[PDB]
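so i finally got all the pieces together for this one. its five components total, 1141 residues if u count the protein bits. some of the lines might not be protein, just check the labels. i wanna see the whole assembly predicted at once instead of chain by chain like last time, that was a mess tbh
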Amino acid sequence: NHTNVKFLFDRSRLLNVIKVLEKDAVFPRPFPTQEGAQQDDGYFCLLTPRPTVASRPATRFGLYANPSGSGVLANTSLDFNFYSLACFTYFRSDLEVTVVSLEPDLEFAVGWFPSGSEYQASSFVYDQLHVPFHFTGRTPRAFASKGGKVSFVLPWNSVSSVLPVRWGGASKLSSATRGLPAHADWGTIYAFVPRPNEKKSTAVKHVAVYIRYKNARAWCPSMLPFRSYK
Amino acid sequence: NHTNVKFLFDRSRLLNVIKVLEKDAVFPRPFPTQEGAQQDDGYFCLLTPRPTVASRPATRFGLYANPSGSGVLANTSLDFNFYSLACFTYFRSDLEVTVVSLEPDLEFAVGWFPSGSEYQASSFVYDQLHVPFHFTGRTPRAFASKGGKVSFVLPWNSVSSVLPVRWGGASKLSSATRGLPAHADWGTIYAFVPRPNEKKSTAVKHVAVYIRYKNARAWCPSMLPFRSYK
Amino acid sequence: WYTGRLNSWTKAVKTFSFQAVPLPGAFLSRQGGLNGGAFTATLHRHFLMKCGWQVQVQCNLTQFHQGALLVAMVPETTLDVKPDGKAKSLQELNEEQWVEMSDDYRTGKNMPFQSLGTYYRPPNWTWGPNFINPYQVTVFPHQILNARTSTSVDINVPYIGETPTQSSETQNSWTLLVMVLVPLDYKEGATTDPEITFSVRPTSPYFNGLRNRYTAG
Amino acid sequence: GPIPTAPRENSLMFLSTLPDDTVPAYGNVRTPPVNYLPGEITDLLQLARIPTLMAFERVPDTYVPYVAVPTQFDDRPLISFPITLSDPVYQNTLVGAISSNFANYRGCIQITLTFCGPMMARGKFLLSYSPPNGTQPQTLSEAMQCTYSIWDIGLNSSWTFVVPYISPSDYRETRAITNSVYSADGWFSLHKLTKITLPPDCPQSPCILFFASAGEDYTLRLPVDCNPSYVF
Amino acid sequence: GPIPTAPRENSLMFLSTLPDDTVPAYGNVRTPPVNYLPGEITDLLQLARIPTLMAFERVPDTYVPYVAVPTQFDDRPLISFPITLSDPVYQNTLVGAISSNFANYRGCIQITLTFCGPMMARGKFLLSYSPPNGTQPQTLSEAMQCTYSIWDIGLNSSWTFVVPYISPSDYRETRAITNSVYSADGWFSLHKLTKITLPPDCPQSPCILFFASAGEDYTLRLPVDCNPSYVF
């Protein structure tokens, strides 16, 4: 029974590593983007097996094999395991998320919103203490003790009927890039510390992400990636 | 079914941040208040979505957009989410309370009393150690280990049949301000450390508050706040 | 029934080379000298469409000919565009005459993408999800074209799509391609460089909406 | 037997939307019955159905919930707008406000119009809807090709109009961060069909009003947290 | 009564393949029905059954999925290879790719061949399989002792061939870190039986192709994690 798609696609795998928020911060802005902006990177990540760049959907995958240069570097990701696993033009399943710290004896919470929405900015001031509004909202916020462990299951949250593995259409009449999907994701995830911005610290914190597919289904078989004869 | 008021009003949201008690302390006194009093602020908070100032009911909302000045600043709060959510002249529901620390590895307990009562003052002396009486009483006192987490549900505790969202009457025959309700709250909450006052420390501690509505109902629809065209 | 002319086979064509006809997109450019005349314009006055397809091929070899051609229906392909992100021109078609294999297509490397801008460093592109696997093409609905027995092509693919229906000017979920399995060879005197002709038929369409003729953005 | 302690994977956590209840604190309470209050509410659809009045910025900071038919004539529509809830025109309607607190919607949109003018004046009007295309239609000729209806001035005073629900999905984006097929759905417009009649000594410049309401199949989804900007 | 707390031996742990579920987060959701999509997939065997084309490095970086019958004659087989999925020849077949993601396999292997040449030419071919031994057989005489079959050129154009499943175990190693009995299973070869006929004025050098597919009893086991080398 090992060949069953359900029995195959029911295990956790790492996705990406992200830093820990310490302020409201500005969300990344679409491309092309000019210099001088205050948008910060490496704090927000989108839930999607397909390639992405700088927390946004993408078509071509890249890597920084050349370290030297000038400018701002970017994040990238792609589910090597999922893509190599099998062939399916279409796919749908519930996405399960789990997070574990990568620093000694740390405590924090996590925040999420589904597709179509966007990060909530701005901050309040309580008794001379500034706190971003993202602490409270309509959507779940999770809390864990020191050490840390977070787990829950998100339901399907995209308008499209299924998730296209290799799509070839366009999304809009003008300037739309061919083949770039629209909402093939489960939303965005982010982490933050329940402390006022006034007590920000210089040392950076980093955290990994693991995901798991539940109740997977597929359609319209396809091809598999080529491997060299070198 | 998402449109159902019950399915909507069943999630936790932040309310306010307060300091941690270290002594008996004097309760705030009604307005107008003259200088030289020993009443201290930022320790007691009332459970109410409607606007409040200095831990007391209020009519007009204010904010300290101008930091500079002289005198004593005040606390304020209003459930942005609840007010923007919908329209209902009347409302009633059980109020659920939850508290989490905002400092590293802290332990404490919480204390509460319902409407109509007031803070119990004065302190005893045991074997040359002074302890406020608020430690013991007729009403619940909660205890948690280090790190901290507090949760419980309070039943409805006000004489009025429901909670008026936008009221326009008066409470008393003489000097009563029009539209200011009387007991639209679930009581007052406060936090303290189980240590003698003799061992007070200078460093301040701060704690947040989260609330959640259970089994909500409404009547007599109303209007919604205006938004500018700027 | 719409008919179109493709480029003519020549022995100079290498192996794994190909050309494709993305339906219904090719209609806009009247690819291969094809003019439906009714559906082509009817699409303009509507926005949403949902129909099937039915294709055919022809190529006449002779007793003293040999070769092998691969024809298949590959969905969700995006090979009908230049690497920049612009579809090829008629001059470019007449020039190339064929799509030659390249590591770029093997890896999905040079498929269209958005430039990052001045804020970012230049990333090194390595791979993409629209790669081409030359050998495993046979998996999809397909047929062979052998000079000794190549008669014609026939296929009937049911409708597919991320949604029950899509916009006409953008939708592309089915595509026809031809591949040269064995390079053509023959003794001189018989039919030289036979032509390749294609036919297309939609089935059970349902045009949606109503508006004036679509206007360029 | 002893506690067969099976440790839980991720206990000792706080979660915002945990459905289960908690421990009671001060049970054994009694409450005053509230059956005497009428006008109970069940779902926001009750308020969403009741119509309200839209508005437009004054023609060259005062938005106007009415439009007056001009004496001048042109082939372009007199008033039109895209059907997109993020537009300012809906930015104060009850339907728009409620929709602003959800990820997506589903169903038809209902529009109503009203006339306010003289006694012995008559005229004709044409209502039309146009799905999205390269650009908004301009000429009444181009609009006529699209779906349209005839509204006579004198037959009735409110020729109700409903935009059919058309989209290549099951829902649509309530807010449009970037223009997309699932977000915008073209535009709607009104055209003056023929010159109206000006009777003796009656005032001029009649007045017309428009109202919007959610259709019977209107439905929202995926609640979110509000923007607190209105406090400012 | 009070919680008869029975502490668990190793709770407060995170495990990759824990089968049980977790707490729902945003329940009470509805989805668009997807019954309209045809071509549903159940197991990878569906793709594993469909045949595909192998290839070989060009005879003295271009692998070739075809072989042409030469005019020269020798007793050695014209094309042969070991039956080992790790070999390059299978390194792009669907069966090979799928097998590369498992510890072990089980079942028979199916092979198909096709001819592409002139009209008035005929010939004979011999197919054979040889279990492992000291070294691969070379002469058609030696091969003839092993299992073999006769494929006529003219009777049909694809004389399907299947290698029987033989091994001293229940499975075999999908990949061979070191040569072992359970890993390799000898070789398979094809021999030209007799000189083919060259008719008047027909072209020369006919073309032959080979295809591979998993047998009806083919089965994998013990999934593993992939090699991500293909990204480079």
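The radius of gyration of chain B is 19 Å.
The longest helix of chain B spans residues 80-85.
anyway lmk what u think
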